[PDB]
Design a protein around this ligand. Structure first.
Ligand SMILES: COC(=O)Nc1cccc2c(Oc3ncccc3-c3ccnc(N[C@H]4CCCNC4)n3)c(C)ccc12
Ligand SMILES: COC(=O)Nc1cccc2c(Oc3ncccc3-c3ccnc(N[C@H]4CCCNC4)n3)c(C)ccc12
Lengths: 366, 389
């Protein structure tokens, strides 16, 4: 009814999962801690001890699963792990995102940070997928966090560190798509990967968020392994940025290109493909009161950014008619433009990639 | 090689000392082992459960396990490089820079993790703050220890009770015990870290008495420097005898003491743009120009470099005894940095670090007076990351 094996004790009725060569995972207890216990046969001992040593070497991190201890009996070996509420899989297939808002994005920042923690220790994750991503129990505030397991099927790369980026880029789309997969469904995930067939049609260029998600993932699931962002690179991507940071970025860019010549390498880079970004004439795409409150060129990103810089600067000096439509600072403010000009931040970010080494534009790139 | 269960230790390797602490091993993990007599079980099992309840956090010491012997009880703890105390008495701060400041954010964050669980730390001193082993990068982190003196407040709020060691203790125990007690002890550790070992309430054998008396001395922090003031103002609030005048654990994390020069600057822009339409009799500026003459050294146009003084276009109409116009200068100088001549950019400094530093070196009370005076627009989301939540 309830086995006690050293400091690991569990009740078989409370079963959490069942897999591979006769392995069952229970809800047990270690030193009065709620833990998930996995019993394994001698066929998996040599493999088990290999994963375990890595846990000891990387459990220091929050976004890596915490290993406690292991004990062996006459027949089995039991492995103690921090009890977690659910997987990223159970979290997407059952839990509604309308009352979470900011939670899913946080899980990728966490997952990516923990995945980076392995890279700092010259470790390579190979089987990274939502069934392995673990969701922590609710804290006192009510917040949660993500943790990785299994440090070495559709999440596999066709081909090093760049491999984990491929798996992750598919996991990002998985959380965003509420269950879909960039390379199609099972029994075609492996094949389409070999071909290079991707489809992120859950992300349309008619919205700001979708584009910013595509640019990142396109790089990640890319055939060219060297064309994939490092783990810490992903974290300084606009995908995780706040509205305060989006706006202050536009401003740093706007003040930066004030003296740069129109024949400048940057402005050409910036105005290159601008017509689609500004929809030919941005004076027409915006509200009447603002349109009536405005040398700003329609096909100009630079003048568009110039308007945004100076209008915020003198926001308190603006009419009540405009302040209402422009939106309160800074959230609805930048949203007023990104909603209307979605490729802007993506285009701006990559076009200002030249000035990445500049100290004013380090916290955006690294 | 002594072996008691899965925890094994070698007696020759003693880390500290009727409790003695050894260097042992748990499941091929490097751990610090403490041996206790049966007399200290009641305190230990109470201590361990708190570690069990809060070791999830990085800035809290990780408890692994304990084993029982014929005579003793052995407790396994994550091995740490050194204490904050050993860290101050031996390590030079000139080649670390922000590491010490980070140890306080870590320490403060871990203390908040306990406060999130309605816990009060009572025996807090640098000997309890532990320094993690170097990571692959070479970096470290701080972790709290010793929860023998820790109060698990039953429910929600209120205050209960009202003792080990001396000089780091709050007066409320010497009946008003709360989370803010940890702030007093913690606030004193800052001065210990900022200094080369010094303490706001004097040296040992009089730290205890002067606390009762209220004698504090932050003479290691003079208003002739920027950091000292921003540190003094914070610590002054933290070590305040008046317990309700003490910052919460989470507020301290949002104090200018931990801000970067980018945030000092990015804050000034938000402030200057905010007072753009404000009347001279405006409620915000009245608080701001209140005691401003001393902040700007009466006339700031005189205190700054020559090229800038000659680069201050007269059309803006800048008054000397006016702080807002000075902030306007920094705002207007920041906006058009690329439009300014190369002559000024050299003295003003490259953006944004040397730029804001150019003023703080000359105006240490600036960021302090502004932040303290700009508490009014705190509820506005443009002024959330500077104050609360
Ligand atoms: C030697 O290597 C190992 O033994 N590695 C591992 C040991 C232990 C677990 C491990 C583990 O975790 C689980 N594996 C299978 C079923 C359930 C859990 C599990 C673990 C912790 N919490 C929960 N929570 C439940 C709550 C109810 C809904 N389902 C999730 N499940 C993974 C993914 C990988 C390696 C593990
Ligand atoms: C639950 O009750 C307990 O038994 N609690 C505790 C158990 C075990 C340790 C505990 C502990 O730890 C130490 N206590 C005294 C001396 C040294 C260490 C110690 C621990 C880990 N690393 C190091 N590093 C050395 C490296 C060489 C230089 N000196 C520092 N020191 C504290 C502070 C509190 C409670 C402990």
């Amino acid at each position: 009814s309830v086995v006690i094996v050293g400091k690991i004790s569990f009740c078989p009725k409370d079963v959490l999962g069942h897999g591979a060569e006769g392995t069952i995972v229970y809800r047990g207890m270690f030193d009065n801690r709620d833990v998930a216990v996995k019993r394994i046969l001698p066929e998996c001992f040599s493999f088990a001890d290999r994963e375990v040593q890595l846990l000891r070497e990387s459990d220091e991190h929050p976004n890596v699963i915490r290993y406690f201890c292991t004990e062996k009996d006459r027949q089995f070996q039991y492995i103690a792990i921090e009890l977690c509420a659910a997987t990223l899989q159970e979290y997407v297939e059952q839990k509604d995102f309308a009352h979470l808002g900011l939670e899913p994005i946080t899980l990728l920042q966490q997952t990516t940070s923990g995945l980076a923690h392995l890279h700092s220790l010259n470790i390579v994750h190979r089987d990274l997928k939502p069934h392995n991503i673990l969701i922590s129990m609710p804290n006192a505030h009510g917040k949660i966090k993500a943790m990785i397991s299994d440090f070495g099927e559709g999440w596999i790369a066709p081909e090093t560190y760049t491999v984990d980026i491929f798996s992750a880029g598919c996991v990002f789309y998985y959380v965003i798509s509420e269950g879909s997969h960039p390379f199609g469904k099972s029994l075609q995930r492996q094949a389409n990967i070999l071909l290079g067939a991707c489809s992120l049609d859950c992300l349309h260029p008619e919205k700001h968020e979708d584009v910013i998600a595509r640019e990142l993932i396109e790089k990640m699931i890319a055939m060219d392994p060297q064309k994939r962002p490092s783990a810490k690179h992903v974290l300084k991507h606009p995908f995780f940025w706040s509205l305060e940071k989006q706006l202050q970025f536009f401003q740093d860019v706007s003040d930066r290109i004030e003296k740069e010549s129109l024949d400048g390498p940057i402005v050409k880079q910036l105005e290159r493909g601008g017509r689609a970004v500004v929809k030919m004439d941005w004076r027409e795409n915006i509200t009447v009161p603002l349109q009536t409150d405005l040398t700003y060129k329609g096909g100009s990103v630079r003048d568009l950014l110039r308007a945004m810089r100076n209008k915020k600067h003198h926001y308190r000096e603006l009419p009540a008619e405009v302040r209402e439509t422009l939106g309160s600072l800074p959230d609805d403010f930048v949203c007023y433009f990104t909603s209307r000009f979605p490729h802007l931040l993506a285009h701006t970010y990559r076009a200002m990639e030249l000035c990445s080494h500049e100290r004013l534009f380090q916290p955006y790139y690294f």
